[PDB]
Design a protein around this ligand. Structure first.
Ligand SMILES: [Ca+2]
Length: 579
DNA sequence: GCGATCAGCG
DNA sequence: ACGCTGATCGCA
């Protein structure tokens, strides 16, 4: 139905200096994945190209890499990385429909060109899943069906750029797309392609050691239970704990007895089995997710893992990381933290360098709320988390353990983001009236935070959404819900999204500024990971000392707030040492 | 496939 | 009855 040239070679008119481009990669993980087809729509027509012809044509390759040839795309990072795996560079991406749709309304869950086109009443294109199918049935269709689908996706991109930019501009989000998210996309593509090298001999050794400790704990559980059972089975675990052993029931799930760690911790006074269950789950989580899981996704020839940072998924503007998730590598228990010893530089005599923001969301909050005491606290470079721990546990500063700090940190964000007296009581193991008076007290010291909580909720009711400092947006239609519970979850999102999203805006700007600076100074250091407020790099050891001044400065100057930004930084031979 | 659970970020 | 996530596993 749609007209296009099914082309056997590349011609000059496919290389105009503006086009909609589709480089189709069907597999979810696009690392080292087939490119199944190419479409180009421009002023001279609509063209389908087979990748074996276009990607071996030197003039098409030059066009891909020419930054003065502008491409409109959907999910351009996916194309850029699949092309990098083919040894081909993509430059000149000036519009990315996925990131435009994400910015306009992250709740759409826009995952293909069709879902984005629907936002503008454009429906002359099919959903990807209708063309390829799902699951075992998923397949690349016959070439004429493939070619028209790719041409219709590019025809859509061609038509939708203008209405999407128009609405971005009305939302004050046009520079957010063109100067933040699209430059970031190219940077994430370099980080993903570069990968992180893994010491598989060390991982494998930790795996055999764990499997031994697992059995020993597993046997002691069976002997404390007086029988054998599937310790991972909540049916059986619940039966053992709360029927055979008659331990008190403190919580239920939709499906039975809860055995979450906070329940198990409150049962430690009653029976010794519960802490063995705890230790068992921790060892098995390390084994399942971080030894075996990692080794599954290590590319064996290079010993690299190549994550995918999803840039159009979270409702706040954060990234997430998938397959493997390199944003939740263990750190807090020393047994788990050692897995970070298997993450190593990718070259001899290079080192890992990790820099991260100190208390970023509370500094953002002090700026946005304009709370005098909170601003004054960060002007003094106070550690609110440690001060809060001192108060909670009635200890001196030197007595504050890492445990108490991250516990006090959960109270600090709990209170600003709407924890109730009940939940704070359960989290702190204190009475519900103490919990409530503690909350009254903290708002006595930070009344400007309290006003911000009330003001932001009123502003979401009036406007229908909340924004971040760089104008990221999140609609909250449930804020006017008649249902008490639904409305409440929406109010807590109103309190939290502008703070967490602004912290996301800042580190994203930090990454763009950092890359420009590294390039300007002609350094080999390059980014490997982002972990929400943390940047991890690797670099030749000859560069460590320059990076100790460069990276913190770049991150601290990314934005200017009414309080300073603070950055800590470490480097070492493995990710474990970069602390 | 989903819900409970737990690893991380604040 | 703080918010944002992803992987694994049993299935009440
Ligand atoms: Ca931090």
């Amino acid at each position: 139905k749609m007209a296009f040239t099914l082309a056997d070679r590349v011609t000059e008119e496919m290389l105009a200096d503006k086009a909609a481009l589709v480089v189709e990669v069907v597999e979810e993980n696009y690392h080292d994945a087939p490119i199944v087809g190419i479409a180009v729509v421009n002023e001279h027509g609509r063209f389908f190209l087979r990748p074996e012809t276009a990607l071996a044509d030197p003039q098409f390759v030059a066009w891909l890499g020419d930054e003065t040839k502008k491409k409109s795309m959907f999910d351009s990072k996916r194309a850029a990385v699949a092309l990098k795996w083919k040894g081909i560079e993509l430059c000149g991406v000036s519009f990315d429909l996925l990131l435009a749709a994400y910015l306009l309304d992250p709740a759409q869950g826009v995952d293909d060109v069709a879902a984005a086109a629907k936002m503008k009443q454009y429906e002359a294109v099919r959903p990807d899943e209708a063309v390829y199918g799902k699951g075992a049935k998923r397949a690349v269709p016959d070439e004429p069906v493939l070619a028209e689908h790719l041409v219709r996706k590019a025809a859509a991109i061609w038509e939708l750029e203008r209405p999407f930019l128009d609405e971005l501009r009305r939302n004050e989000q046009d520079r957010l797309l063109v100067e933040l998210e699209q430059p970031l996309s190219s940077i994430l593509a370099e980080m993903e392609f570069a990968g992180v090298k893994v010491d598989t001999k060390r991982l494998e050794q930790m795996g055999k050691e764990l499997a031994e400790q697992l059995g020993t704990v597993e046997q002691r559980i069976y002997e404390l239970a007086g029988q054998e059972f599937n310790i991972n089975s909540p049916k059986q675990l619940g039966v053992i704990l709360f029927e055979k052993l008659q331990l008190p029931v403190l919580k239920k799930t939709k499906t039975g007895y809860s055995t979450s760690a906070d329940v198990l911790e409150k049962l430690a006074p009653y029976h010794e089995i519960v802490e063995n269950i705890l230790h068992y789950r921790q060892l098995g989580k390390l084994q399942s997710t971080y030894i075996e899981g990692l080794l599954k996704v290590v590319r064996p020839a290079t010993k690299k893992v190549h994550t995918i940072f999803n840039q159009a998924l979270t409702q706040t503007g954060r990234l997430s990381s998938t397959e493997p998730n390199l944003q939740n590598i263990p750190i807090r228990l020393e047994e788990g933290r050692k897995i970070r010893q298997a993450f190593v530089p990718s070259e001899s005599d290079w080192l890992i360098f990790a820099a991260d923001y100190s208390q970023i969301e509370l500094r953002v909050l002090a700026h946005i709320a304009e709370d005098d005491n909170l601003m004054e606290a960060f002007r003094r470079d106070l550690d609110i988390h440690t001060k809060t721990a001192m108060d909670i546990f009635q200890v001196s500063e030197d007595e504050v353990t890492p445990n108490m700090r991250r516990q006090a940190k959960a109270v600090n964000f709990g209170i600003v983001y709407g924890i109730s007296d009940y939940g704070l009581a359960q989290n702190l193991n204190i009475s519900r009236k103490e919990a409530a008076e503690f909350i009254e007290r903290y708002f006595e010291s930070f009344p400007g935070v309290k006003r911000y909580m009330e003001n932001i909720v009123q502003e979401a009711k009036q406007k229908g959404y909340v924004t971040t400092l760089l104008h990221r947006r999140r609609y909250l239609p449930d804020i006017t819900s008649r249902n008490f519970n639904v409305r409440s979850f929406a109010e807590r999102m109103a309190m939290n999204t502008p703070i967490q999203g602004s912290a996301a805006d800042i580190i994203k700007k930090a990454m763009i500024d950092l890359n420009a600076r590294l390039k300007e100074e002609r350094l080999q250091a390059h980014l490997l990971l982002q972990v929400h407020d943390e940047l991890i790099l690797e670099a030749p050891k000859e560069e460590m000392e320059r990076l100790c001044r460069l990276v913190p400065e770049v991150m601290e100057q990314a934005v200017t707030l009414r309080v300073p930004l603070k950055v800590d930084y470490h480097y070492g031979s493995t990710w474990y040492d970069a602390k």
